[PDB]
Design a protein around this ligand. Structure first.
Ligand SMILES: Nc1ncnc2c1ncn2[C@@H]1O[C@H](COP(=O)(O)OP(=O)(O)OP(=O)(O)O)[C@@H](O)[C@H]1O
Ligand SMILES: Nc1ncnc2c1ncn2[C@@H]1O[C@H](COP(=O)(O)OP(=O)(O)O)[C@@H](O)[C@H]1O
Ligand SMILES: Nc1ncnc2c1ncn2[C@@H]1O[C@H](COP(=O)(O)OP(=O)(O)O)[C@@H](O)[C@H]1O
Ligand SMILES: Nc1ncnc2c1ncn2[C@@H]1O[C@H](COP(=O)(O)OP(=O)(O)O)[C@@H](O)[C@H]1O
Ligand SMILES: [Mg+2]
Ligand SMILES: [Mg+2]
Lengths: 1622, 128, 145
């Protein structure tokens, strides 16, 4: 009755729980408690789902299912209500607090009023009945919110121009997105909602301090908690509107900091030039003032001391008081060093670290001044230093501080920076400061350039933070166009902020030239500030940006950082480069950075540690092997140094934690004395460097570690708590867990290493070959951390290369300038907004796919310390601390150093995932997961026991796998492709035993028979899984090797390969030849497309295809064109009902969008409680996507095919992302079958190994000479039953056919011409052609048979030949072959060289005399001139042959022509003339200079309607010149092969087509009403009526390239090489 | 064709000049601690892989030019470069001066392998 | 009126500036026109059927690029700008580019400093001709420096 209690508890909770209401400005009663509502619903939903597992669920099934429906309906309603209420709050604020918007946008204002009325009406109902069930039962409440959400979104998108007007009134709004700005404007009264947006408008203001009323802004605060209290508080009541008090807050921030600086300077002067400093007073002064002012005060005091000392040294020979300046710095630095040797508050400790870094530089500068004997303040070695002059007598507090370097003078901006980590002030950084400040004085931009990881971006920000400026970083890409850059400049100019444009050379060259105009006009405006004649009490300086007059603040600056060494980057035009002063930052001063950082962190041996760690990184870059995922640069060094301080702090906390439970001897000073500082550094190195190492580099690095750090050992923490959770998660996921050298131990170490990287890096890559356990490593870790820490883990897995880069990050509208989020931007923005508590969960964004610089370099500012996603609309999204950016990849051969250096690396090797582990996983699943949806599980469990001995290490399967890798395969061989195929086949064997038990309900299979079946099937499955993608000789050789090593009984035939045997359900080997009968084919089905003559290969391939298809396993058939791949697949599908096949024809230009159109036509998207599911429209059917040329799609320059990545996503992840709404779609009842030619063929690319692990490959070769004799000997016997007197000649006719076909296939190959492909397709056409010429014939002599045989050979083999020698050879060998197999025949009457056949002079297709044909064509040409085209033609012999060839194709279904020849040879005219003779209407597209793709689509619709609906025979004649775009042929490639274009008819066009098809089918007498039935009939009409004639000139390069663009042109069209006139 | 015969002689001749053997350094507990062994082990390891790849590619070209194995996409790309005298990008594994043609690379690559052989011979016979 | 070419707005601005200038004698300079080879062909056809003011001049700035149409090159007069042939030519170009009043300011020693700068600029630029020996790399020491 425990289940009954849960139902009672669920019933009682929802009979009383009321929507918690709050009054909102006396207008309505909003709903709070969204977290309480959502968690409560989720908790009951889980409990209802969990109680289904209980066996006692049957009695309460209906009641539980009723509650599942109700709880799901509650989720679907209030997940929309929350977004509707949120949007209404800030839209209501805007449309009430700004009367100007009513006039500006009257339509939107009235539309919002109507929606605001329906919202308030629904609010009042909720107030009356706040009970959730009563609200849930409100009529149409679900649809009301759905309409409210959509309608409110339209109003939101219509306020864009209003938002652009408000951005001027507070220019920091230019750096805020439209939606966030509406929240800011609309919530101007609800100040608590404004807090999350301050980090976007300010450098270091994360929140504001408010009184209890929230009416006065008392001050500002940073993200670390540091507070600035305003001297004069800002009252919001006296300045209500949002943009004025925000301006007053920005001013008080600057005024308060300047006033606070003056007070700080007064106190710090006492510390300066003082013999002894009391630490308590000095620490008190540090704590009292902000971090930025504390360092600023120290710099001011030091500068004035040096100025004072140099002034006294005017006489030259006077004593130097500079030593006292050095003395004061030494004393102060000793106190700072002593303070960081002990525990400090986190804010004070960082302040102390900043002061140590500042004073180390002052110590170095003062030492340099003393060593150089400088005695004058005007000496350049002092002027070149950055100096700080403070005038307390200055009236304006904002101008009391002057920062001067050389001749450059700057005011301090007094932007609140919070606590920004400072750089070590190195000689490179000193040179950077000097160069950039020279550019600033010259009103020029700064252009630091160099390789990645040299400090270019950090130095620009450091200089800006030194000057108190708001520095904005932008990660530039090709989407930063002229309009986007200008708008960013407008914001920068009015705010007075610095723009640091990183990767600035990733802009297009045309955009760089255009931007140079905007940069120049700003710089001219900046020089207007510098003019002494200009007075501040005048018209403000203004430059023209985007055709508008924009005020320019003197504090703004432009900086660009670039790597000029990166190939593929844009070269800056010279006119742009003259606007920037460039500095090379190539060799950072690593040893100085390491020494100062370790000294500021409290390491006593910092000099010793720095002298070891920096050379150690240099040694690693050279001593260790070279890998693409190896980085030992400054980022890697910085990571270790920062981690060293963290490790030192935890040990000190750990040491005293031991002291708490062991005495009371806390002696912190002595604690730092006995502290293994070298061991701390080694731990940071190993926690950060070791996971990236390959196996053979691991001992090398530890030898290097012992070389540089003798006697120091690395010992990982034994993480019992995490390992216990990992072991449990592995058990629930059927995974193998090990410890140390056990099975799975290497993989568990990688999981633990991955966890360590997650705690040090916000961006990390898991790199390793396909099938290394990378995915399971982070999927298991995510679940384990949920159990260990209690924090829910959420993973968003993205295939970045399965979609366009526009769909990944988003697009800026060219005209409306509206921003649409991409997939990654939408996910990250959803987490930042945290509407449903995403900030309290562990959020992992996994980019599972290929890494190329084009898309991942948009994440440079995300993966570095900026933690910002910068968008071309000026918006900057901060990465929250709970988010990890992860990249699961198989290689990094296209990633640049910029990306590799910014991410933690965990390397997976194929040895990490052992084959024993994979075998355990398959067996564990087989013993626990039933295949039916237990008698089925009992079969699997018994079968698992039988398979177990062979699946051990060094077993049969392991030895077979090792031998298979030594063989040659049509595709690259990977371990998981074999095992994936092997496990699918064994699952089918378990289904076979169950199906046998269904056939034998009396006697189910016993273990003796079950054992006898499984062992042989396992051998059978091993051969096909490991050699099915190899040729017969390789399939054989694996057979003997198995025969040697196996103990399973095998067929005892002397010379018959094992691959020639199947396994009967009785556990006996049975030859495949028993299922290959010598059939006799019905005479009307001779060589018909659906007829398959059983051969040894067909029955084996069909059985193998059946197994994979029945398991819904994706598969690829590979073989030469025409080898029978489509025939075998469709033959196997006939024995597999409940499966519909849809043929897709890939080209070089095929994108995932071709798959999406097929989904739109055959499948529906439905909203389910678990997400969007895509399933076939027809119920109970599995829909098979057949891709015929899956390896043709273009491979980009980074080795990626987008559609292949898209298919890999749908197979491995079971779905894809819908780019319109950024929503994951799950596939249901959809499987994929691929066909392709071998990757070595021209135009073919190798398939990705990450796609092949899911897709078993079967190799279908050309039938051999004996197989061809069996196939077409059967056809010839059937077709020669038409003439009983010709039955005897069946065998010689087949032999002649096979001999000439084999000779032609050898004689002409793809090496000579790209279209010289001969396959059994020609044999099928050969038999069909003879059969069509024999049906209306009552009798025929044997010489008449040879003439038809010779005629069809010429049409099939000679018509495609280019050269006269080739045509001469074909003509001669036709005679040779015929007489060899047909002696005692009259050669002349059978082989007269002018072989012409026509049905023009009679009812039948009989031979025609050349002169008789010439007279008839002249007679018909006379009529043709008077009716269609009055262009006289001269009739020569080749024309008569050509018109007969065209006439043949127009009389065949799907008769398509590829006419190749020189222009003006009559290809079009003859086609029209023959089309007029056969009753075919001629359609030609009427191209012009403005003819575009949608013009071609509309033209395609016109032809398809006429031929598909009106039953009109049409010759669609189209030239190569008509192809104005590659998209034209992607449509024709589908049309030629399938007679249909999946996406051509959409919207109203499809509806009109259905009306016309229903009318058209009615005139034919067919009873069709279903749209699917109508579309199939429409396709069948297009197949029989539409004829496409393609005309093109002979171009060797063009013809070869043409095959990839339109493969249907060369396998669905008959090619006739008309060439030039002879 | 004329190119097919001329390229056959060149590839066969290159297989004569380029050495055929390169034995990896035997890793030892006390050899890993030797910095010279650590650098020299890298040289042979990357050198042996490049040596096998070039020899295999050249052997396939000879067999192609004898009409015994069919021309694949990789072979078509490699054969086109060899006819034009451009150094194949697959062969390019160590930094070289810009504008270096394939005939100079083969002679340069042959000398580097000889030195690599002597270094491994000393390590094999005599120790690190 | 000076216009950069790459932007779509730049094309519209160029046409309006040219149309206004051909009726008033105004000067128009279009920079980096090699970035728009297709638009350059249309500009050549536009200039052919036009009889502007006698003082009108159109300046096109481009890099030496094979993408520049032949028809435009034939219609215009080409001036090649490159490093001066030698030290003498380099220094004469420098002294012509700097206004005389700039050198001849109150400190008489300013003239010798400019000469030293001109000599230094000539020597540094001429060493670039010796690609490897003069400097390890082909630095872009130029007018901005
Ligand atoms: N620890 C483990 N124990 C047992 N089986 C495992 C383990 N880890 C992975 N496997 C299995 O072995 C295979 C490894 O797949 P996984 O997704 O982990 O590899 P991957 O390297 O991420 O793959 P890809 O390169 O295709 O992205 C799967 O069949 C998986 O079920
Ligand atoms: N002078 C310095 N002091 C401290 N850290 C530095 C210094 N210069 C660079 N770094 C660090 O080096 C890494 C790379 O700096 P970054 O500015 O991103 O380089 P770049 O822009 O050249 O790629 C960062 O971790 C940065 O903080
Ligand atoms: N056993 C067979 N029975 C009937 N036709 C066969 C047989 N083997 C080969 N063929 C012929 O070979 C051709 C194969 O065509 P298809 O299946 O489209 O080839 P692919 O898919 O390899 O491009 C057809 O003409 C088919 O009739
Ligand atoms: N057999 C012919 N006799 C006379 N004129 C011909 C003949 N074939 C073509 N022409 C001429 O060439 C023109 C172009 O014919 P068309 O069919 O468009 O050529 P193609 O398709 O080969 O480019 C015709 O309009 C006609 O003037
Ligand atoms: Mg940078
Ligand atoms: Mg994976």
């Amino acid at each position: 009755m425990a289940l009954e209690e849960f139902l009672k508890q669920i019933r009682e909770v929802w009979n009383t729980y009321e929507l918690d209401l709050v009054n909102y400005q006396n207008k309505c009663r909003l709903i709070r408690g969204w977290d309480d509502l959502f968690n409560k619903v989720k908790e009951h939903i889980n409990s209802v789902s969990a109680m289904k597992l209980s066996p006692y669920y049957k009695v309460f099934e209906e009641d539980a299912l009723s509650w599942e429906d109700k709880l799901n309906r509650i989720m679907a309603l209030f997940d929309v209500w929350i977004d509707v209420q949120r949007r209404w709050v800030y839209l209501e604020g805007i449309f009430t607090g700004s009367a100007d918007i009513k006039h500006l946008l009257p339509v939107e204002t009235q539309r919002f009023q109507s929606i605001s009325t329906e919202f308030l009406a629904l609010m009042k109902k909720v107030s009356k009945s706040p009970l959730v069930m009563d609200v849930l039962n409100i009529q149409g409440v679900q649809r009301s919110l759905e309409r409210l959400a959509d309608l409110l979104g339209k109003i939101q998108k219509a306020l864009g121009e209003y938002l652009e007007r408000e951005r001027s009134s507070f220019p920091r709004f230019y750096f805020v997105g439209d939606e966030d700005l509406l929240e800011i404007i609309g919530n101007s009264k609800n100040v608590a909602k404004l807090q999350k947006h301050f980090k976007k408008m300010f450098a270091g203001v994360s929140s504001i301090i408010l009184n209890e009323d929230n009416s006065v802004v008392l001050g500002i605060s940073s993200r670390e908690g540091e507070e600035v209290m305003f001297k004069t508080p800002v009252s919001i009541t006296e300045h209500p509107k949002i943009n004025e008090w925000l301006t007053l807050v920005e001013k008080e921030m600057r005024v308060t900091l300047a006033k606070l600086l003056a007070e700080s300077v007064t106190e710090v002067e006492i510390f300066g030039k003082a013999t002894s400093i009391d630490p308590n007073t000095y620490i008190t002064w540090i704590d009292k003032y902000q971090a930025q002012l504390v360092v600023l005060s120290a710099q001011i005091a030091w500068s004035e001391n040096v100025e004072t000392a140099l002034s006294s040294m005017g006489g030259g020979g006077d004593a130097a008081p500079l030593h006292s300046v050095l003395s004061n710095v030494e004393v102060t630095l000793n106190v700072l060093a002593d303070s960081v040797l002990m525990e400090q508050p986190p804010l004070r400790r960082r302040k102390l670290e900043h002061l140590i870094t500042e004073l180390v530089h002052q110590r170095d500068v003062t030492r340099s001044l003393i060593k150089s004997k400088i005695d004058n303040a005007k000496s350049f070695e002092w002027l070149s230093q950055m100096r700080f002059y403070f005038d307390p007598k200055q009236t304006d507090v904002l101008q009391q501080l002057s920062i001067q370097m050389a001749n450059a003078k700057f005011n301090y901006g007094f932007e609140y920076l919070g606590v920004q980590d400072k750089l070590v002030q190195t000689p490179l950084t000193d040179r950077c400061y000097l160069t950039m400040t020279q550019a600033l004085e010259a009103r020029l931009g700064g252009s630091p350039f160099g390789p990645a990881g040299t400090g270019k971006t950090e130095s620009v920000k450091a200089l800006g933070h030194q000057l108190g400026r708001f520095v904005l970083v932008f990660n530039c890409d090709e989407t930063f166009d002229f309009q986007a850059m200008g708008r960013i400049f407008v914001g920068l100019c009015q705010v007075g902020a610095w723009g640091c444009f990183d990767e600035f050379n990733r802009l297009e060259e045309r955009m760089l030239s255009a931007v140079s105009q905007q940069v120049q006009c700003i710089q001219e405006a900046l020089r207007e500030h510098s003019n002494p004649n200009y007075d501040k009490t005048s018209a403000p300086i203004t430059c023209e940006l985007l055709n508008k007059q924009v005020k320019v603040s003197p504090d703004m600056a432009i900086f660009i950082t670039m790597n000029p060494g990166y190939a593929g980057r844009s070269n800056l035009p010279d006119n742009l480069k003259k606007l920037f002063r460039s500095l090379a930052m190539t060799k950072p001063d690593r040893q100085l950075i390491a020494q100062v950082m370790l000294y500021s962190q409290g390491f006593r041996t910092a000099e010793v540690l720095a002298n070891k760690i920096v050379p150690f990184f240099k040694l690693c870059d050279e001593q260790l092997s070279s890998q693409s995922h190896y980085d030992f640069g400054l980022r890697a060094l910085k990571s270790v140094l920062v981690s060293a301080g963290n490790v030192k702090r935890e040990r000190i906390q750990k040491i005293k934690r031991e002291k708490e439970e062991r005495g009371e001897a806390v002696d912190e000073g002595e604690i730092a004395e006995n502290l293994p500082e070298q061991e701390i550094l080694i731990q940071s190195v190993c926690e950060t460097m070791v996971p990236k190492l390959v196996a053979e580099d691991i001992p090398l690095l530890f030898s290097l570690l012992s070389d540089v750090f003798p006697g120091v050992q690395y010992h990982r923490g034994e993480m019992t708590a995490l390992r216990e959770e990992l072991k449990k998660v592995c058990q629930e996921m059927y995974l193998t867990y090990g410890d140390g050298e056990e099975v799975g131990g290497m993989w568990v170490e990688k999981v633990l290493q991955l966890y360590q990287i997650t705690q040090i890096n916000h961006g990390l890559m898991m790199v390793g070959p396909s099938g290394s356990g990378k995915s399971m490593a982070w999927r298991v870790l995510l679940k384990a951390l949920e159990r260990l820490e209690g924090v829910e883990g959420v993973a968003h897995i993205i295939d970045p290369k399965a979609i366009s880069k526009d769909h990944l990050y988003g697009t800026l509208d060219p005209n409306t300038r509206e921003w649409t989020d991409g997939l990654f931007t939408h996910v990250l923005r959803k987490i930042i907004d945290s509407v449903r508590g995403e900030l309290q969960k562990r959020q992992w964004i996994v980019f599972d796919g290929d890494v190329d610089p084009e898309w991942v370099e948009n994440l440079n500012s995300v993966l570095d310390d900026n933690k910002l996603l910068t968008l071309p609309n000026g918006e900057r999204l901060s990465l929250p601390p709970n988010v990890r950016i992860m990249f699961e990849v198989q290689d990094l051969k296209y990633a640049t150093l910029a990306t590799v250096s910014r991410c933690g690396m965990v390397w997976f090797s194929e040895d990490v995932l052992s084959t024993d582990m994979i075998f355990n996983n398959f067996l564990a699943r087989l013993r626990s997961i039933p295949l039916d949806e237990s008698p089925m599980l009992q079969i699997q469990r018994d079968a698992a026991t039988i398979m177990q001995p062979y699946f051990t290490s060094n077993g049969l399967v392991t030895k077979a796998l090792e031998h298979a890798f030594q063989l040659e395969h049509i595709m690259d061989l990977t371990r998981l492709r074999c095992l994936g195929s092997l496990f699918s086949m064994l699952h089918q064997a378990c289904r076979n035993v169950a199906q046998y038990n269904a056939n034998h309900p009396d006697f189910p299979m016993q273990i003796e028979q079950l054992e006898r079946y499984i062992q042989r099937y396992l051998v059978y499955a091993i051969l096909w899984s490991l050699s099915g993608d190899s040729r017969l000789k390789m399939r054989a050789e694996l057979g003997e090797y198995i025969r040697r090593i196996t103990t399973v009984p095998l067929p005892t035939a002397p010379n018959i390969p094992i691959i020639d045997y199947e396994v009967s359900i009785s556990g006996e080997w049975s030859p495949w030849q028993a299922k290959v009968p010598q059939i006799e084919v019905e005479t009307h089905k001779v060589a018909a497309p659906d007829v398959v003559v059983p051969t040894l290969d067909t029955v084996r391939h069909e059985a193998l295809l059946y197994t994979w298809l029945a398991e819904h396993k994706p598969l690829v058939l590979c073989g030469p064109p025409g080898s029978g791949k489509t025939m075998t697949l469709f033959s196997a599908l006939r024995a597999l009902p409940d499966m519909e096949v849809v043929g897709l024809n890939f080209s070089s230009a095929t994108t995932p969008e071709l798959l999406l159109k097929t989904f739109d036509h055959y499948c529906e998207y439905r909203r389910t409680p678990n997400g969007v599911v895509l399933a076939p429209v027809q119920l109970g059917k599995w829909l098979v996507l057949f891709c015929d040329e899956i390896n043709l799609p273009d491979m980009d320059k980074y080795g990626t095919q987008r559609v292949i990545s898209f298919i890999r996503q749908m197979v491995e992840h079971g779905g894809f992302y819908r780019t319109s709404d950024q929503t994951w779609v799950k596939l249901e009842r959809i499987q994929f079958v691929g066909a392709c030619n071998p990757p070595t063929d021209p135009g073919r690319k190798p398939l990705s190994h990450r796609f092949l692990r899911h897709v078993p490959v079967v190799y279908v070769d050309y039938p051999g000479p004996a197989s061809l004799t069996q196939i077409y000997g059967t056809f010839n016997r059937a077709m020669l039953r038409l003439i009983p007197s010709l039955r005897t000649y069946a065998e010689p006719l087949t032999a002649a056919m096979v001999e000439f076909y084999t000779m032609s296939q050898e004689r002409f190959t793809q090496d000579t011409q790209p279209h010289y492909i001969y396959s059994p397709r020609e044999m099928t056409r050969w038999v069909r052609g003879i059969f069509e010429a024999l049906r209306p014939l009552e009798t025929l002599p044997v010489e008449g048979l040879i003439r038809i045989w010779a005629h069809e050979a010429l049409r099939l083999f000679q018509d495609r030949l280019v050269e006269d020698e080739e045509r001469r050879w074909t003509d001669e060998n036709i005679d040779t072959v015929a007489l060899k197999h047909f002696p005692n025949i009259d050669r002349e009457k059978a082989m007269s060289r002018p072989i012409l056949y026509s049905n023009w002079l009679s009812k039948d297709y009989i031979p025609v005399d050349q002169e008789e044909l010439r007279d008839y064509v002249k007679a018909r040409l006379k009529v043709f001139y008077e009716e269609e085209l009055d262009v006289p033609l001269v009739l020569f012999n080749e024309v008569l042959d050509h018109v007969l060839r065209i006439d043949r194709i127009f009389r065949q279904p799907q008769g398509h022509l590829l006419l190749i020849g020189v222009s003006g040879a009559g290809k079009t005219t003859l086609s029209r003339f023959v089309a007029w003779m056969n009753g075919l209407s001629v359609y030609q597209i009427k191209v012009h200079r403005k003819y575009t793709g949608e013009d071609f689509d509309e033209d395609l619709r016109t032809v398809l309607r006429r031929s598909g609906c009106k039953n009109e025979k049409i010759a669609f004649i189209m030239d190569e010149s008509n192809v104005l775009d590659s998209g034209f042929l992607e449509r024709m490639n589908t049309l030629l092969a399938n007679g249909e274009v999946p996406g051509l008819f959409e919207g109203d066009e499809y509806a009109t087509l259905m009306t016309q098809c229903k009318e058209g089918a009615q005139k034919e007498g067919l009873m069709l009403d279903s749209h699917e039935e109508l579309y199939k009939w429409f396709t069948s009409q297009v197949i029989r009526n539409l004829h496409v004639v393609f005309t093109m000139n002979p171009s060797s390069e063009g013809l070869k390239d043409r095959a990839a663009t339109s493969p249907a042109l060369f396998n669905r069209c008959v090619l006739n090489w008309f060439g030039d006139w002879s | 064709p004329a190119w097919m015969r001329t390229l056959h002689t060149t590839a066969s001749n290159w297989l004569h000049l380029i050495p055929q053997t390169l034995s990896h350094l035997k890793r030892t507990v006390e050899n890993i601690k030797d910095p010279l062994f650590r650098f020299f082990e890298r040289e042979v390891k990357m050198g042996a892989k490049l040596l096998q790849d070039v020899r295999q590619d050249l052997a396939d070209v000879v067999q192609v030019c004898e009409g015994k194995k069919k021309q694949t996409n990789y072979l078509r790309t490699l054969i086109n470069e060899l006819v034009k005298g451009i150094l194949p990008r697959s062969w390019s594994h160590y930094t070289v001066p810009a504008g270096m043609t394939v005939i100079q690379w083969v002679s340069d690559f042959s000398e580097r392998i000889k030195q690599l052989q002597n270094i491994s011979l000393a390590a094999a016979s005599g120790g690190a | 009126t000076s216009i950069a070419i790459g932007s779509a707005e730049g094309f519209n601005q160029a046409d309006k500036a040219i149309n206004t200038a051909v009726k008033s004698g105004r000067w128009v300079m279009l920079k980096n026109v090699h970035l728009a080879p297709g638009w350059l062909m249309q500009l050549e056809k536009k200039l052919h059927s036009l009889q502007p003011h006698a003082c009108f001049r159109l300046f096109l700035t481009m890099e030496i690029n094979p993408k520049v149409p032949v028809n435009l090159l034939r219609a215009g007069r080409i001036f090649v700008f490159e490093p001066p042939p030698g030290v003498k030519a380099n220094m004469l170009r420098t002294f012509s580019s700097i206004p005389v009043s700039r050198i001849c300011k109150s400190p008489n020693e300013r003239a010798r400093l400019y000469f030293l700068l001109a000599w230094f600029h000539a020597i540094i630029q001429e060493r670039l001709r010796y690609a490897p020996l003069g400097w390890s790399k082909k630095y872009e020491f130029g007018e901005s420096d």
